[PDB]
């Protein structure tokens, strides 16, 4: 499958002479697997999945060392950004980074990512070629000039093509596994001879899922209400979709649930 790794990094400055808070979270196939947080008592990378509990302390120590590197890089960056944007002291600001790689089932790099944001907005980002930068901003042009002069891209490309790929591969051997949705449809009054039908999917992992409603064959993309997929809190996810239908016409409507843990898409209707 289209395996991925990401590192999501955040530094947040706060008023009153405090150092910036730095948090890095590592993800493999969208599951959080490591985390470092400067606010902790002993700042170090920690395992956040049990399949990481098999790495020796040299892994944690290496990664923790990189984190102290990033903290500092982020801290100086944050200060520069203040100046680039002509901003006052005693405010609160965020610098975020996303990094990582996409892999094929042949273990071959598909896409590499490296993107920064300031205050939650694109600042600069390495393009797909892994050679050139797209600056969002006036400020970011100055950063782009620095990184073109310096060859920074080469550094990030080598990381994305080498280390990122090799380590994603290792982390996966270390770990495929899914939980299928349990689906049901609930019935809810409205007035004016109308009824809400709500198709629920629960207990599913991974979080990617598609719910459709059919009126006797035809898909109701338009009249359908969704909610954003949400965590149940136990590792699994939840989603529902609903349509308003005429009273008595309920059996004409069919819910379909598509999920990669399923041998067939589920198909279901309101059952009184």
């Amino acid at each position: 499958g289209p395996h991925s790794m990401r590192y999501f990094e955040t530094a947040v400055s706060r008023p009153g002479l405090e150092e910036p808070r730095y948090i890095s979270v590592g993800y493999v196939d969208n599951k959080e697997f490591v985390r470092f947080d400067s606010d902790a008592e002993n700042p170090r990378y920690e395992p956040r999945a049990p399949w990481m509990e098999q790495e020796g302390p040299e892994y944690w120590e290496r990664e923790t060392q990189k984190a102290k590197g990033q903290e500092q890089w982020f801290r100086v960056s944050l200060r520069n950004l203040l100046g680039y944007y002509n901003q006052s002291a005693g405010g609160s600001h965020t610098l975020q980074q996303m990094s990582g790689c996409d892999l094929g089932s042949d273990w071959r790099l598909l896409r590499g990512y490296l993107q920064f944001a300031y205050e939650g907005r694109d600042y600069i980002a390495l393009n797909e070629d892994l050679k050139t930068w797209t600056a969002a901003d006036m400020a970011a042009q100055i950063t782009r000039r620095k990184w073109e002069q310096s060859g920074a891209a080469e550094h990030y490309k080598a990381y994305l093509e080498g280390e990122c790929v090799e380590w994603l591969h290792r982390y996966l051997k270390n770990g495929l596994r899914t939980d299928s949705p349990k689906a049901h449809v609930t019935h809810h009054p409205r007035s004016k001879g109308e009824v809400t039908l709500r198709c629920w999917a629960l207990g599913f992992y991974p979080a990617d899922i598609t719910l459709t409603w059919q009126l006797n064959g035809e898909e109701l993309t338009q009249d359908m209400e969704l909610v954003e997929t949400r965590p149940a809190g136990d590792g699994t996810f939840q989603k529902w979709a609903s349509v308003v239908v005429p009273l008595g016409k309920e059996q004409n409507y069919t819910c379909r649930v598509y999920h990669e843990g399923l041998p067939e898409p589920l198909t279901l209707r309101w059952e009184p």
């Binding site: 984190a67 890089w73 960056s77 520069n80 550094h155 990030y156």
Partner: peptide
């Protein structure tokens, strides 16, 4: 294994 950003910073 995460990235180690090179200088220059932002």
């Amino acid at each position: 294994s995460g990235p180690s950003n090179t200088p220059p910073e932002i």
